[PDB]
């Protein structure tokens, strides 16, 4: 239940927050919303143990 943003197009400005869950488009082809090759969801989970 603890998440962090791993992929973002540009760096954040000071005291800024991004809540977007938009699929990070790392390639040339559009992602189209569905997760798939070269399209990664930017919020990754902090699997604390």
């Amino acid at each position: 239940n603890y998440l962090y943003r791993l992929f973002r197009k540009s760096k954040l400005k000071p005291f800024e927050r991004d809540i977007s869950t938009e699929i990070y488009q790392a390639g040339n082809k559009p992602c189209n919303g569905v997760a798939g090759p070269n399209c990664y969801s930017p919020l990754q989970s902090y699997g604390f143990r």
Binding site: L6, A26, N28, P37, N38, Y40, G47, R49
Partner: protein, 595 residues
């Protein structure tokens, strides 16, 4: 936008989910190994399945990135490690047959029971009983019966299996752009793309040959001395001009000669440097043994042990109700979690082995910062070498007098030095010709240099020519005599022991010249020298990110395997063996004169 940035982002995703899934898999494997219960078995199976599934899908997604347009060495190394197709490149039928063959070889080797004719009510297994008879008994015909019976049964039941195994592995390697399976195994030492530090797959064989050619005089002298002492043990069966009988080497296969210390002792009147009595008198528990190892590692400059290491490791046998695997193993769970599974007892041995496994854990800790797929040794030899150098340094008389196990008035004369160096020679120099012979046989049988109907005849010839050990009776192709060993029957690389043996003494010379040792190499201790720990730590932190040649240049100042440290370590023993082999004949003949 380019391929390299796509590779970086994909490797970041892979590294994150790999570390999480790997941690779950390693935790389930740890929970099975420290608690053998069926729910832990099924948990380990589910985690291993999900890990292999993950590494499969991720390799499928990883092979869409060609390597020729990636210039960064770290990204290239991680993608080269990830894109390996393993056994998946074949058809489903051939892959399933290969896994079936591997499983049935494992079950035949593990559950192989060979016993005496006319007494079949109960029989003896290899691990509980055959090692005892082949390592302690002094009866010629009894050892001959056990040796011939085990090789006969296991060879007849394993020869067609190995016949199909070589073909399937050769097809696997040739579909994966390798010349043969031997080339696939030699690919671990391959370095491509770095100028000056380049190492080829094919160069390893001549490097091994060039080292072995200088190994041969020392080994010949050792062989002659061992032969003379075994002639004292067995009067008429062994010939002065011939080779050693195969079932007299102290092990089942002749891999180690350490079981002959009793028969081949130089000075039996002198005691050894066993310090078990001092530990049991002063009540040295396992915790304080690991604390002394920690004190040595903080003396040399490396980091302390983590809190989770002390909290989560099981350094004592838990009891009869809870069953655990007693094999000494260092675990790198990941996520900063390092553990040692060791059923520690109070012995000089377990103390040295604890130093070895803590060397493994320090090696795993230094490279932790590296990405997940590069968290390994630079080659297969470095990981065990960095533990064996600690085992070398901790066993010295100086280190035992420093920590109070050995009396301060102990006199170190040359006779106990000869004794120590001969025990070390039987353990270290004895395994080198067997390892080189076995790996060179496996390389030629994968390469196709050896014909299919000429296996045994070639193998025995090499045992006569390289190891200087003769067979008792001739064996035809109905037998599969190499396959009686654990590593070859269960698809394991064997050249790691040879490389580890050379890297051990190379690292030892580098640290001892770094720490300003003014005597012989075998007396050297790396304790309290922080420049030597820094020199070693400059190689430990790298992991697999840099070439093994560069790591070797970082430690010993050379980029290739050298045999000079090993012969320099055994120099007084070499002079002693030259002195006492005047009456005997050094060297062997390939004729069957003993038997």
């Amino acid at each position: 936008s380019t391929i390299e940035e796509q590779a970086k982002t994909f490797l970041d995703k892979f590294n994150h989910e790999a570390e999480d899934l790997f941690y779950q898999s390693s935790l389930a494997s740890w929970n099975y190994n420290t608690n053998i219960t069926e729910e832990n078995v099924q948990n380990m199976n589910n985690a291993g399945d999900k890990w292999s599934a993950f590494l499969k899908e991720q390799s499928t997604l990883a092979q869409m990135y060609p390597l020729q347009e990636i210039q960064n060495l770290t990204v290239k190394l991680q993608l080269q490690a990830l894109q390996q197709n393993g056994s998946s490149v074949l058809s489903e039928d051939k892959s399933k047959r290969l896994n079936t063959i591997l499983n049935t070889m494992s079950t035949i080797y593990s559950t192989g029971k060979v016993c005496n004719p006319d007494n079949p009510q109960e029989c003896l297994l290899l691990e509980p009983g055959l090692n005892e008879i082949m390592a302690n008994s002094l009866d010629y015909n009894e050892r001959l019966w056990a040796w011939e019976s085990w090789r006969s049964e296991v060879g007849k039941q394993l020869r067609p299996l190995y016949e199909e195994y070589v073909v399937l592995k050769n097809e696997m390697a040739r579909a994966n752009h390798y010349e043969d399976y031997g080339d696939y195994w030699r690919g671990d030492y391959e370095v491509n793309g770095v100028d000056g530090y380049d190492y080829s797959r094919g160069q390893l064989i001549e490097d091994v040959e060039h080292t072995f050619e200088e190994i041969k005089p020392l080994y010949e002298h050792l062989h002659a001395y061992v032969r003379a002492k075994l002639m004292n043990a067995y009067p008429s069966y062994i010939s002065p001009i011939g080779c050693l009988p195969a079932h007299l080497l102290g092990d089942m296969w002749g891999r180690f000669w350490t079981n002959l210390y009793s028969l081949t002792v130089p000075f039996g009147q002198k005691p050894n440097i066993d310090v078990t009595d001092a530990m049991v008198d002063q009540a040295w528990d396992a915790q304080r043994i690991f604390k002394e190892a920690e004190k040595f590692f903080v003396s040399v400059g490396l980091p302390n042990m983590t809190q989770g290491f002390w909290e989560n490791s099981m350094l004592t046998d838990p009891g009869n109700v809870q069953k655990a695997v007693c094999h000494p193993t260092a675990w790198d769970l990941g996520k900063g979690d390092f553990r040692i599974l060791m059923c520690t007892k109070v012995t000089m041995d377990d103390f040295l082995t604890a130093h070895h496994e803590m060397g493994h854990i320090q090696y795993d800790m230094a490279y932790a910062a590296q990405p997940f797929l590069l968290r390994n040794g630079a080659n297969e030899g470095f990981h065990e070498a960095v533990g064996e150098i600690m085992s070398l340094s901790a066993a010295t008389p100086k280190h035992l007098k420093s920590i109070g196990l050995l009396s301060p008035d102990f006199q170190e004369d040359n006779e106990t030095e000869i004794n120590f160096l001969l025990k070390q020679a039987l353990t270290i120099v004895g395994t080198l010709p067997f390892t080189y012979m076995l790996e060179k046989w496996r390389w030629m049988v994968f390469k196709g240099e050896i014909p299919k109907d000429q296996w045994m005849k070639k193998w025995w010839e090499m045992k006569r020519e390289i190891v200087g050990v003769v067979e008792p009776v001739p064996h035809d192709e109905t037998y599969c005599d190499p396959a009686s060993l654990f590593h070859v029957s269960n698809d394991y690389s064997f050249i790691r022991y040879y490389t580890r043996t050379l890297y051990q003494f190379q690292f030892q010379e580098a640290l001892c010249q770094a720490a300003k040792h003014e005597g012989p190499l075998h007396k050297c201790d790396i304790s309290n020298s922080t420049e030597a720990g820094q020199k070693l730590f400059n190689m430990l932190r790298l992991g697999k990110s840099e070439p093994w040649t560069l790591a070797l240049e970082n430690v010993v100042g050379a980029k290739n395997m050298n045999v000079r440290p090993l012969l320099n370590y055994f120099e007084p023993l070499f002079t002693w063996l030259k002195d006492q082999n005047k009456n005997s004949f050094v060297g062997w003949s390939t004729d069957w004169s003993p038997y």
